[PDB]
Amino acid sequence: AEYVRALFDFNGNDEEDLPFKKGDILRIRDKPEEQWWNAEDSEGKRGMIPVPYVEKYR
């Protein structure tokens, strides 16, 4: 799996967004556009995340 680390808190705005906290590790499910990816959190919740707010995590 591909993972990213949150650089900032993301409260989200829209129903489809996946909120997260600074430092969280998120799994990338797919990449429907350049700056918004579909991710999954450790609780199994899914949604859109802003790519500028994350870093590759390996």
Binding site: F8, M48, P50, P52, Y53
Partner: peptide, 13 residues
């Protein structure tokens, strides 16, 4: 680096 603004959503099918 700071906190970049939230990116626009392109919302393409």
């Amino acid at each position: 680096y700071g906190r970049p603004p939230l990116p626009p959503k392109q919302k393409r099918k």
